[PDB]
């Protein structure tokens, strides 16, 4: 009778369907690069 | 970014470099003294 309780649980393991968003790391990368420009931009203005 | 607009303006305040000509008042004084002789000179000539 427990087999059916597991049927959902087999499903539950299954359904997760948005896990590995790697290039999350790559909008993170864009954030890190543009926001790496944020670090320097008033120093343009400072040299000048 | 406005800091640089002010850099010129700090300069502009600075550059003025011929302001206090006091003894302007003293060539004025020479004018006033010699030209004070101008007032009387035909009155030499008038007494005489």
Swiss-Prot record, chains A, B:
Residues of the full protein shown: 7 to 54 of 150
GO CC annotations, alphabetized: membrane; type IV pilus
Subunit structure: The pili are polar flexible filaments of about 5.4 nanometers diameter and 2.5 micrometers average length; they consist of only a single polypeptide chain arranged in a helical configuration of five subunits per turn in the assembled pilus.
Presence of keyword Iron: no
Protein name: Fimbrial protein
Signal peptide (residue range): none
Record keywords: Disulfide bond, Fimbrium, Membrane, Methylation, Transmembrane, Transmembrane helix
Family: Belongs to the N-Me-Phe pilin family.
Superkingdom in the source lineage: Bacteria
Subcellular location: Fimbrium; Membrane
Organism: Pseudomonas aeruginosa
Transmembrane parts of this sequence: 1-21
Positions of post-translational N-methylphenylalanine modification: 1
An annotated GO BP: type IV pilus-dependent motility
